Each structure stands twice: as structure tokens, then as C-alpha cells.
């Protein structure tokens, strides 16, 4: 049993809810929240801008030190950093950004990072400001992640639609 509440069950391991990932993280304080990161860990908007704002910019400060030491992530890659006031840990995962021309095949590689964590609160990778089809992102998630993932869809139409059209 875990603390997640109100989710619709899609598969053995994937759950979904219409939610503001920030408000959900604050309520649950999960072990892992996933950030929709870019390779520079520049958290300006969408999930990253919203998560970072909720940390009062402490996520950005920590991220800038990470990049200064390690250099940029790979598209499809990830790093584990603090969850600050939102979670124990934040898994920063870089899905491909269609609005930068990145290979959508890298979305599967991005989701494979989730398998290193038993339970996660996450957004749909490459949805929102990253420019991929969220229906596709959910399919890749279901077909890639084997650990237990609790998905936060920001848009109500998209929440109702992802459940309405799920195979
Ligand atoms: O709903 C989400 O979680 C991210 N997300 N994803 C989309 C998308 F449909 F992919 F464009 C949209 C949003 C929110 C804003 C409306 C359109």
C-alpha cells in the first residue's frame, strides 16, 4: 500500500490522475518526483518551471552546481538530485523536445530511467511544452516502465481523453 489517492488504474503498474504535479508532490511527499528536464537543467516553465518555483529556486541553484561539475545531460538521460520540499528525490529526466527536432525514439530511452525506481510520481515525458503527442507518450510509458508510476496530467481535456482513448 502507498499514499497515492484518486488515481485511475491503467495497467498492473501504471496509474493516472488529473492533477497539478506540484500540488500532488506537496500533498504526498513521494520518494521520487520526476521532472520534465532539459539537458541544461534550466527549469523555466511547464513542469520544471513549476517544480522549481515551488522550491523557491533551490532546485535551480542545485541544478546549476550539478551542471558546472558534470556538464549537460543526454537527451534520454537523467540524474537524481534532491526533491527539496516536494519529495525525497527528484529524478530529472530529459525526454526529446520535438520543438528542437529531437528523435522521438529517445522517448523510450527517457522512460527507461523510471525502472531504476520502485515508485514514482511523474508527468508524461515530452508532453506540454516539449511538443510530443501525449497519447503516444502514455503508450510508451505503459510499454516501457515496469515499476509503479503515478502519472499527473495537467490538462483536464487531456486527462479525460487519455483515459477515454487508452487501449
Ligand atoms: O497536460 C499535461 O500534463 C501537459 N500537456 N500536454 C499537452 C499536449 F497535448 F501534449 F500538448 C498539453 C498539456 C497542458 C496544456 C494543454 C496541452
Domain boundaries, the chain: 1-167
What's the 160 CA to ligand 1 centre distance in angstroms? 12
Is 103 in contact with 132 (CB distance < 8 Å)?
no
Question: Reported resolution in A?
Answer: 1.0
Approach to solving = X-ray
Is 76 in contact with 94 (CB distance < 8 Å)?
yes
Atom of ligand 1 nearest to the CA of 153: 3
Q: Does residue 155's CB lie within 6 angstroms of at least one atom of ligand 1?
A: yes
Q: Nearest Cα to 141, choosing from 165, 166, 164, 107?
A: 107
Distances 161 to 46, 111, 138, 165, 167 between C-alpha atoms, Å = 20, 21, 11, 6, 12
Is 137 in contact with 165 (CB distance < 8 Å)?
no
CA distance linking residue 76 with residue 87, whole number of Å: 22
The upper half-sphere exposure of residue 158, i.e. CA atoms within 13 Å in the direction of its Cβ, equals 20
CB neighbour list of residue 124: distance below 8 Å, 6 or more residues apart? 134, 137, 138, 141, 151, 153
CA-nearest residue for atom 8, ligand 1, is 128
Q: Does residue 127's CB lie within 6 angstroms of at least one atom of ligand 1?
A: yes
Q: Does residue 16's CB lie within 6 angstroms of at least one atom of ligand 1?
A: no
Amino acid at each position: 500500500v502507498n499514499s497515492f489517492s484518486g488515481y485511475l488504474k491503467l495497467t498492473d503498474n501504471v496509474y493516472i490522475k488529473n492533477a497539478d504535479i506540484v500540488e500532488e508532490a506537496k500533498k504526498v511527499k513521494p520518494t521520487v518526483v520526476v521532472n520534465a528536464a532539459n539537458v541544461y537543467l534550466k527549469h523555466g516553465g511547464g513542469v520544471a518551471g513549476a517544480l522549481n518555483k515551488a522550491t523557491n529556486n533551490a532546485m535551480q541553484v542545485e541544478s546549476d552546481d550539478y551542471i558546472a561539475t558534470n556538464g549537460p545531460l543526454k537527451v534520454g538521460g537523467s540524474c537524481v538530485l534532491s526533491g527539496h520540499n516536494l519529495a525525497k528525490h527528484c529524478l530529472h529526466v530529459v525526454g526529446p523536445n520535438v520543438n528542437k527536432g529531437e528523435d522521438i525514439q529517445l522517448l523510450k530511452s527517457a522512460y527507461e530511467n523510471f525502472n531504476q525506481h520502485e515508485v514514482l510520481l511523474a508527468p508524461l515525458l515530452s508532453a506540454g511544452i516539449f511538443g510530443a503527442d501525449p497519447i503516444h507518450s502514455l503508450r510508451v510509458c505503459v510499454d516501457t516502465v515496469r515499476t509503479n508510476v503515478y502519472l499527473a496530467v495537467f490538462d483536464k481535456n487531456l486527462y479525460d481523453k487519455l483515459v477515454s482513448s487508452f487501449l
